[PDB]
Amino acid sequence: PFVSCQRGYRGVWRGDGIMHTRCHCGAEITGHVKNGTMRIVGPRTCRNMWSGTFPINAYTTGPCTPLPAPNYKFALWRVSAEEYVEIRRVGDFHYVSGMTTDNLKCPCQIPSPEFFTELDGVRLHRFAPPCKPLLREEVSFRVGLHEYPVGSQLPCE
Amino acid sequence: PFVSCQRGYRGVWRGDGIMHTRCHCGAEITGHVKNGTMRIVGPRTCRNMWSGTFPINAYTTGPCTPLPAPNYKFALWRVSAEEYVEIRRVGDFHYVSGMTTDNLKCPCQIPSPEFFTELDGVRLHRFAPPCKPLLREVSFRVHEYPVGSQLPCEP
Amino acid sequence: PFVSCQRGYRGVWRGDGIMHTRCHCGAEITGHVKNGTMRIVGPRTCRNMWSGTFPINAYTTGPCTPLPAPNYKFALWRVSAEEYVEIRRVGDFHYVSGMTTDNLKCPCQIPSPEFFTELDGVRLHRFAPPCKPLLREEVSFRVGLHEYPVGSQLPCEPEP
Amino acid sequence: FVSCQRGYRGVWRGDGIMHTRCHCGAEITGHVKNGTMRIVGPRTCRNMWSGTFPINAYTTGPCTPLPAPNYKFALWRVSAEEYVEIRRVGDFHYVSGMTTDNLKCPCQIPSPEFFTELDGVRLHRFAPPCKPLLREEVSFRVGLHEYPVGSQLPCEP
Ligand SMILES: [Zn+2]
Ligand SMILES: [Zn+2]
Ligand SMILES: [Zn+2]
Ligand SMILES: [Zn+2]
C-alpha cells in the first residue's frame, strides 16, 4: 500500500545532525536528528510526509545512520558484490528464505540490523545493486564448506 | 612478500565483537574489538598481521564499523553510483583535488570521515565500485567550480 | 623464511633527526624523524621492515628518543646495576608482577612511559643488561623499609 | 606502490654502494659485494620488495649491470635518437622493429649491457624518449645492403 514515492525508514538514528534526501516523486525531504529522533520537513504531496518516513537513496546526505529494531519480518542481505539473500525472522531465529543465485556462499552469524540492505521493503543504505529474482525453492547455500537447502536456519544460533 | 597485501586500517572501531576478513594475498585476518580497539590476528605471511592492520573487503564479515581520525591528507568520496572525488585536507579546510568525471554534481559539505570510501589509501567500506582515472587538470557543480576550489559551504 | 627479529618501536619520537641502527638479523635499518614521525628505510629481509619499526639495540645512533603511549600491559623497569622488575598495569593501577631476584629494592612511584627499558616487548633504551628469568611466584620486593608480596600494587599508588 | 619504475635485479659489474630514486620517489640504495646487489629502500617502493634497482637519470655509484643473455626483446640505440627492438629466438637475433624507416645498423648484436632496455627495464641513464612502435613495411640498412622488418641480424650464421 505504498506508492513510491519510495518507502521511507522511520526509527532511531545514529548521530545527531541534519539529513537530506530526494523521493522518487521529486520531493526533497529534510531530517533533523537530535537525541536520535529525526523530525521530518517535506511537501504535502510526498507520501513520506504523511507517513513520517524518510526514503534512502543515492541522493541521501548527512552525518546520520539508521538504527532499526531487530523485529523485522524479512531482510534482503548483501553477500556478494551483486548477490543478496532473503532472511525471514520467526521468534529469536532467522532462516534463509531465499537467494539471488544458487550455491551462494554466506556468513553464518546474522548481522546487526543496520547492515541489512532492506528491511520489510525499506532501504537502509544509500547505494546498492538492483535485486535479481529471489529463488526460494530447489536451491542450496554454502556456509563456509557444508551446504544447506533453502529454508534452513543460519548455522550459528 | 609485502607487496600484494591490502593496506589495512588501523584505528578506532565502533561497537564491540569479532571481525573477519581476507587479504588479497590470501591470508585470513581476524580482528577482536573491545571498547573501540581492535587486536589483530593473522598468519605471519601477511603484512597486515605485522602492521596491526585490517584489510576491508567484499570478504569482510562482522558487527564493527571503522571510525577514522579527521586528520587525513587525502580522501575518496563516492558521490554517485559510479562517481568519486578526491578531497585534499589542509588544516580546518578541505579542497577538492580530483574527480573521476568532469562537471559531476557535488555536496557542499564534507561528511564524517567514516562515510568516505577510502582514506589515505585505506578502503573503509566493503563494497566500492572501481575508480576511473581521477582528473586534476575541469570543474564540478555544487553553481559551478574549477578543480582545486574549497567546498563552497566551507567559506 | 622467518627472521629472528627483535621487535622494534613504532610511535612518536623526541627531537627531529636521522637515526641508524642494526637489527637482530643484521639489517642496517635507518629512520628519519620529522615532527615526531620516523620514516623507516632498510632491507626487504627484516621484519621490522614489514611492521615499519625501529629496533633499539646498543647499535642505535642519533638525537631522538621514543615517546610511548601510556596504555601498556607489561613494562620492564631497570632498578639496580643488573636487576629488573616487570610492572603489570591494570587500567589506572600498577602491580609489581615479577622481578629478576627476590627482595629487590624498588621505588614506589611508577615512572613515565619514557623511563621503562622495555614496554610490551619493545626495548626503548640503547643500553641494557640482558634480563634474567622473571620470578613470578613465592617472592617479595622491598619498597624502602617495608617488604611486600609479588602481585602487590605500588605503595605510593592510591589503591582501594 | 603500483606506480614504480621496474628495476633490475641481476648481476653487477664492480663493487660498492649505489644510489638512485624511483618514479614513486622513495630513494633506493644497492650494496654490491661479489657481484650481487642488496636493496635498501622505503617500505613504500615496490622496487625494494622486489629486490630490483630502478635505473634513472638519478642513479649514481661505481657499478655496471650485466644481464644474462636469455632475454626476449631488447632496445638498441643505434643513433642519437633512434632505437631498434631486437627479438631473441633462442638462436640468433632478429630485428623486430625500428623507430624510423631505412635505419642504419651494425650487424653484430652486442653484449647484453649495451642495450638501453631489456624487457621494459632500463639499464642506462639519459637515453632519449622512444617514439611509436612501428611493426611493418619498413627496411633497415646493414652495411650497404638493405633488409626487411623481420630478418636475422646479418652477421649471425
Ligand atoms: Zn515522494
Ligand atoms: Zn596479506
Ligand atoms: Zn631483522
Ligand atoms: Zn618505487
DSSP per residue over B118-148, as a string? Answer: EETTEE-SS-----PPPB---EEE--EEETT
| Nearest-angstrom CA–CA distance, A39 and A41 | 7
| DSSP summary character for residue C100 | S
CB atoms within 10 A of CB D69: 10
Where b means 16+ CB within 10 Å and e means fewer, B122-154 reads: bbbbbbbeebeeeeeeebbeeeebebeeebeee
- The answer to whether residues B96 and B86 touch, using CB atoms and an 8 Å cutoff, is yes
CA distance B96 to B98: 6
Residues of B in contact with A61 (CB under 8 A): 107
What subunits make at least 3 CB pairs under 8 angstroms with A?
B
Q: Tell whether D133 is within 8 A of chain C (Cβ).
A: no
C122 forms beta bridges with C119
Please indicate if any CB of chain B lies within 8 Å of the CB of C52: yes
Q: Which of B17, B25, B16 is nearest to B8 (CA)?
A: B25
| DSSP per-residue string spanning chain D | -TT------SEEES-EEEEEE-SS--EEEEEEETTEEEEEEETT-HHHHTT-----TT-BSS-EEE--S--SEEEEE-SSS-EEEEEE-SSSEEEEE-SSTTEEE-SSPPPGGG-SEESS-B-SSSPPPP-----SS-EEEETTEEEETTPBPTT--
- Collapsing DSSP to helix, strand or coil, B107 comes out as coil
CA neighbours closer than 13 Å in the CB half-sphere of residue B11: 18
Interchain contact B1–D (C-beta under 8 A)? yes
Residue of chain C whose alpha carbon sits nearest to that of D46: C44
**Kind and range of the H or E element at C66?**
strand C65-67
Contact (Cβ atoms closer than 8 angstroms) between residue A40 and residue A30: yes
DSSP structural state of residue B24: T
- Which residues in chain B touch residue D43, judged by CB atoms under 8 angstroms apart? 2
Rounded CA-CA distance B25/A148 in Å is 29
Please enumerate in sequence order all residues whose Cβ is within 8 A of that of D66, keeping only pairs 6 or more positions apart, or say none: D10, D11, D12, D13, D112, D113
Cell of B8: 589495512
> Nearest 5°: phi and psi at D64?
-130, 130
Task: Single out the residue of A92, A95, A123 nearest to residue A108, CA to CA.
Answer: A95
- Residue type at B61 in one-letter notation: T
**Mutation for testing the B interface, residue in C47, C50, C72, C73 having most B CBs under 10 Å:** C50
* 8 Å CB contact between D35 and D12: yes
Q: Do B3 and D43 touch (CB under 8 A)?
A: no
DSSP lists the bridge partners of residue C67 as C12
Of D79, D129, D73, residue with least CA distance to D105: D79
Grid cell of A56 as nine digits: 534512502
| Dihedral angle sign, alpha carbons of residues D142, D144, D149, D155 | negative
> What is d(CA A110, CA A121) in angstroms, rounded to the nearest whole number?
18
Beta-carbon separation of A81 and B127 below 8 A: yes
Are D56 and D11 in contact, with CB atoms under 8 Å apart? no
> In whole angstroms, what is the distance from residue C32 CA to residue C63 CA?
11
**CA C30, CA C37: separation in Å to the nearest integer?**
13
Closest CA to A100 of A143, A144, A141, A54: A141
Q: What is d(CA B121, CA C129) in angstroms, rounded to the nearest whole number? A: 42
Q: Hey, which residues 99-128 in chain B have their CB within 8 Å of chain A?
A: 107, 111-112, 115, 127
Judged by a CB distance cut-off of 8 A, whether residue D1 touches chain B is yes
Query: Structure resolution in Å?
Result: 3.5
Q: Are A157 and A110 in contact (CB under 8 A)?
A: yes
**Preceding omega of B23 cis (within 30 degrees of 0):** no
CA B55–ligand 2 middle distance (angstroms): 8
Q: What is residue B96's three-state secondary structure?
A: strand
Residue D40's Cα: distance from chain center in Å?
A: 22
What distance in Å separates the CA atoms of residue C135 and residue C149, rounded to the nearest whole number?
12
Say how far residue D82 (Cα) sits from the centre of its chain.
Answer: 14
Any contact of A with D, at least 3 CB pairs below 8 A?
no
Best mutation site among C20, C39, C44, C47 for testing chain D: the one with the most D CBs within 10 Å?
Answer: C44
Q: How many CA atoms lie within 13 A of B51 on its CB side?
A: 20
Tell me the one-letter amino acid at D125.
R
Ordered by where they begin, the domains of chain B are: 8-68 (2.20.25.210), 69-151 (2.20.25.220)
B23: cell is 587479504
DSSP C134-158: -B-SS-EEEETTEEEETTPBPSSS-
Please tell me the experimental approach by which this structure was elucidated.
Answer: X-ray
| Sheet containing D139-142, strands listed edge to edge, beginning at the edge strand earlier in sequence | D103-105, D139-142, D145-148
Alpha helices (runs of H) in chain B, residue ranges in sequence order: 47-51
Sheet holding A84-90, edge to edge: A93-99, A84-90, A74-78, A118-119, A122-123
Do D86 and D116 meet the contact criterion of CB atoms below 8 Å apart? no
What whole-number distance in Å separates Cα of residue D146 and Cα of residue D144? Answer: 7
CB–CB of B112 and A63 under 8 A? yes
Cross-chain residue pair B3–D50, CB shorter than 8 Å:
yes
Q: Specify the residue for cell string 602487590.
A: C152
Asked if the Cβ–Cβ distance from A15 to B127 is below 8 Å, we say: no
Beta sheet of B118-119, edge-to-edge order = B93-99, B84-90, B74-78, B118-119, B122-123
Report the distance separating Cα A123 and Cα A7, nearest Å.
8
Q: Give kind and range of the element (H or E) at residue A65.
A: strand A65-67
Contact C40 D40 (CB under 8 A): no
Question: C19, C29 in Cβ contact below 8 A?
Answer: no
CB contact under 8 A, C44 and D48: yes
Q: Give contacts of C32 with chain D, Cβ < 8 Å.
A: none
Number of other residues whose CB lies within 10 A of the CB of residue C144: 10
**Other CB atoms within 10 A of residue D83 CB:** 24
Phi, psi (rounded to 5 degrees) for C81: -95, -15
Residues of C in contact with B50 (CB under 8 A): 47, 50-51
B29-32's contacts with Cβ under 8 Å and 24+ in sequence apart are B29/B54, B29/B55, B31/B62, B31/B64
Closest CA to B66 of B39, B92, B37, B42: B37
Integer Cα distance of D94 and D87 in angstroms: 5
